[PDB]
Paper text:
Using single-particle-based helical reconstruction, we resolved the structures of type I tubes at 5.1-Å resolution and two structures of type II tubes at 7.0-Å and 7.1-Å resolution. The type I and II tubes differ in their diameter and the arrangement of the monomers relative to the tube axis, as well as the diameter and thickness of the engulfed lipid bilayer tube. In contrast to the Vipp1 rings, the monomer orientation of the α1−α3 hairpin with respect to the tube axis is the same over the whole length of the tubes. Nevertheless, the monomer orientation among the tubes differs; in type I tubes, the α1−α3 hairpins are oriented parallel to the tube axis, while, in type II tubes, the hairpins are tilted approximately 45° relative to the tube axis. Remarkably, from rings over type II tubes to type I tubes, the α1−α3 hairpins accommodate a wide range of orientations along the tubulated membrane axis from perpendicular to parallel (from 90° to 0°) while essentially maintaining the same intermolecular contacts to stabilize the assembly. The here-determined structures of Vipp1 polymers in the presence of membranes indicated that helix α0 is immersed in the outer lipid leaflet of the bilayer. However, in contrast to SynPspA helix α0 that protrudes toward the bilayer, Vipp1 α0 lies flat in the membrane plane and appears to be partially submerged into the outer bilayer leaflet. The bilayer thickness in all three Vipp1 tubes remained nearly identical at 35 Å, although the inner leaflet radius changed with the tube diameter. Nevertheless, the same or similar intermolecular interactions of α0 with another α0 and α1 + α4, as observed previously in Vipp1 rings, are present in type I and II tubes.
A prominent member of the PspA family is the vesicle-inducing protein in plastids 1 (Vipp1), also known as IM30 (inner membrane-associated protein of 30 kDa). Vesicle-inducing protein in plastids 1 (Vipp1) is critical for thylakoid membrane biogenesis and maintenance. Vipp1 appears to have two functions: in membrane maintenance (that is, during heat or light stress) and in thylakoid membrane (TM) biogenesis and/or remodeling. Vipp1 binds to negatively charged membranes and membrane binding depends on stored curvature elastic stress.
Numbering used by the authors:
A (entry chain E), B (entry chain E), C (entry chain E), D (entry chain E), E (entry chain E), F (entry chain E): 1 to 215
Write the structure that this text describes.
């Protein structure tokens, strides 16, 4: 349906605006806080399982302690003489003794669930801890991305160095053109040729001075 | 008949709505209260049986005590002299004595019913008590079911951790792509090749410094 | 019937709200006040049984005292001379004497009920007194539960100590990173290598000073 | 019923507010005033029993004094001569004499009730008096509880002494750090080593002065 | 029917407007979210199949454990002496043992369905994962399409470079036309011909200077 | 009948309006969607045929498994001793065995229908797939028809180029007519003939200059 495609495109445009606003390193801190809240909720469920194991433990010890009570009352009645009453007390002692087995098995059963949820806690603890160390390395990688952007700004500064160097190269071309214009006027008037003829006569006089030193 | 099948389907749909609304642990408390009301009604029936046994007991003792009365009146009349009157009193004593046997047998008969209903009370007491202990273990099992649902929420939190980790992985891919773009521009301009030639000349100078330390 | 299951579920939801509002230690005081009202009602029933025993006692003494009256009137009539009147007075004395036995047996019968209800009072007194001592220990156990919740708050304070220690660890990492950046710039400029060469020359001068002390 | 549990919880919350407002020593004075009002009401009941004993006493003496009147009238009529009238007066004297016995027994009967209520008064007097002495010791114990709270305030003053001593210890650490900084600069400039060489030369001069005294 | 052709043409025009609004890369993210919702619904159906396998497993173990109960009761009755009761208990043990086979076969039957749906889950997992990797390559291809559009903009910039170069070529044609107009006026006045005659006389003077250097 | 010819002409006029509104490429997408709905309906009929084949398969296996049951019961009765009962069980085993053949033949019969409808599905799958590829080529052909209409617009642009070129040709004819009017006035005044006589005298002077260079 075309309305479902338009709703998916609007949700994708909203997600693209969310990614454009995403903040470096702050998202990792928010993930660590969210993992801490999840660990507190998991610890509450583990605590409720441990409380069930403690309830069954208390009931077990209650059963044992009450069976000893019936056992003592049976001996009291036996010493008095009412033997049938002692047999009745022992009969109730048997009921308590047998119920001890059911609560014992239930207790060992709850130990398996306790260990299961404890293993889940341990693995999720590993997950949160690797989140911690991953953030440690990921903050170093995010700083390295900012340093790579600084290296790109140093390369981009080549455009500004080309503007300053091009302005200096234009001023140097104007100075060299003024010097060339003085040399072109001095050559075109014959003055450079007269100076070359005078330099040849000065070289002839230097050769005559070398011969005068040689003789 | 099709109307009986529609009535059974409507009652099954009503039962499915009742199961959807069922509350954890509260149903076990309502069962313990219903077992207490049933035990009070059973105790009232047992009390009526015990009252029948007490009525017959009183009638038995009445018969014995009245027979002693006739026995004494017979001796009074004997000492006076009216022997026939004493024989009449003894004749009534015989009637009372014989009725004692019928009420004695009826009393021992009612003892069997008393013991029957008492055994029923004892067994139903065992039933209610195992209901109590069963609720004790069943509340621990219901808490373990809530803790299993918490472990499923910790596994389901993997989808939210994949959304946070995927947002971090997209930001890391954008930073690594900016660094790769700076390295691709630096290589494509020949600057990475000029830096590799300068690093080879720096390694040659380090080998010359090692030879200068060696000589 | 589905309406009976909905009524039991609504009553269980009301009981769960009552347990959520339950107040520590105040419920034990309300139980002690309710046991005091029940003991006052039981004491009123015991007092009515003791009053029945006192009524029969008064009737017994009345019978004895009246029999003595008839005995004296018989002697008065005997001394006067109307012997038949004295025999009549003695005849009534016999009736009173015999009724004394019936009221005597009834009195000893009421003593058994008095002792029965008195034993019930004694046992329920034991029950209320163990309620008192149980509250004494139970207030100590409720304070120990509040202290266990304080120990859980001291362990939960580890999250706040991790926030303060993590802020200090981030400030220490920033200071150590600034020191490392100064050391990396000093090494990369060759200044750390020049300082290591000067430290080797200072160690050579210290060895020359040790040789100059040795000679 | 859930409304009875909510009423008991509201009454327990009201009792907890009453205990929070409880005032030391003033409650013992209010108990002494309440015991004085109860003793005044008990004394009024004892006074009504003593007034019943006084009424019977007056009736007894009235009977005796009236019997003497009839006895005198009998002698008057005897001396006159109407012997039958004297016998009639003596006949009434007998009626009064016999009624004296009934009121005598009733008086001795009321003495038993007087002594019973008097014993109750004595025991409740012991109760109020032990309340008095108990308050005497209990005011000493309440003052000892206030003195124990003062000893807890003296121990709690250790936190304020740690704040003052910690401020002094920080100022002493700043002064010792300034002295250490002067000693570290004096050692690092070689001045402490020059002073140690001068102290060795001063010890050599002291040994030369000891040899110059020895020779 | 012509109304069905008009409805198909209107739906095709609506689809063409939907394709014109289609957004690059956002549709792949919406497909990954839709595959995650479908995987959650498939996982719920697989979980219901696994719960059916667990129900049958519990019933199987229940049957075994109950058969052991009947086996023990048979030995109790045998040791007591009621042999027929023991044979009855063994008769019920046989019923439980045989039902174990039916639930065993049903359990192994449900394992086949569990594996079937698990294989479907695995294959659809492969489908979603190839969707993930396909999006990875498809985002690279979409960026390459944007870069191809940038290369088309660089070629289209040839029209703007032709406008700037054509304006410079018109200014250069105007300057060259002004120079040509000065040369055409200088030639048409005979001044270029007089300068060519003077350049021929200057070449004759240069040849005379070369002969004067040669002699 | 003339009313049937008028109804056919009205339906043909409605079809001509439908063809005038026909949209390029969108009709091929609507045909692909209509082929998908037809394939879903055909797949539902094929699924009902496969379910009939599965029903017969289950009945076949039921027959085999039940025949084994009767075979075992026959051996039980044989070992017990009731031989006639075993022969009866084998008699029922024969009935089940023979019914197996009828359901076997019916199953192989339904396989032929399954294969027939499966072949129809395969061929219609070929039809829909060639519809897909035909649309692939047909979208390329529809784009080529739009490009042919663009080539017709480029040829039709020759009319607009003739309007611009005709306006330029009229301006060029007006400029050439103004130049011709200046030349016609200059010729008609004799000035062109005087300039031709002066050009002949200038050619005579150029021939005299060539003779002066030749001598």
């Amino acid at each position: 349906a075309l309305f479902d495609r338009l709703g998916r495109v609007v949700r994708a445009n909203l997600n693209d605006l969310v990614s454009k606003a995403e903040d470096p390193e702050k998202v990792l801190e928010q993930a660590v806080i969210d993992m801490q809240e999840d660990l507190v909720q998991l610890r509450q469920a583990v605590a409720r399982t441990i409380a069930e194991e403690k309830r069954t433990e208390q009931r077990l010890n209650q059963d044992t302690q009450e069976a000893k009570k019936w056992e003592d009352r049976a001996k009291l009645a036996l010493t008095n003489g009412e033997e049938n009453l002692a047999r009745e007390a022992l009969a109730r002692k048997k009921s308590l003794t047998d119920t001890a087995a059911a609560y014992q098995t239930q207790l060992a059963q709850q130990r398996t669930m306790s260990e299961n949820l404890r293993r889940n806690l341990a693995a999720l603890e590993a997950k949160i801890s690797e989140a911690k160390t991953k953030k440690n390395m990921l903050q170093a990688r995010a700083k390295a991305a900012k340093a790579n952007a600084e290296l790109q700004q140093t390369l981009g500064g080549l455009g500004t160095s080309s503007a300053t160097s091009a302005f200096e190269r234009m001023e140097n071309k104007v100075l060299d053109m003024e010097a060339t214009s003085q040399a072109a006027g001095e050559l075109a008037g014959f003055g450079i040729e007269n100076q070359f003829a005078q330099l040849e006569a000065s070289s002839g006089v230097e050769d005559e001075l070398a011969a005068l030193k040689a003789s």
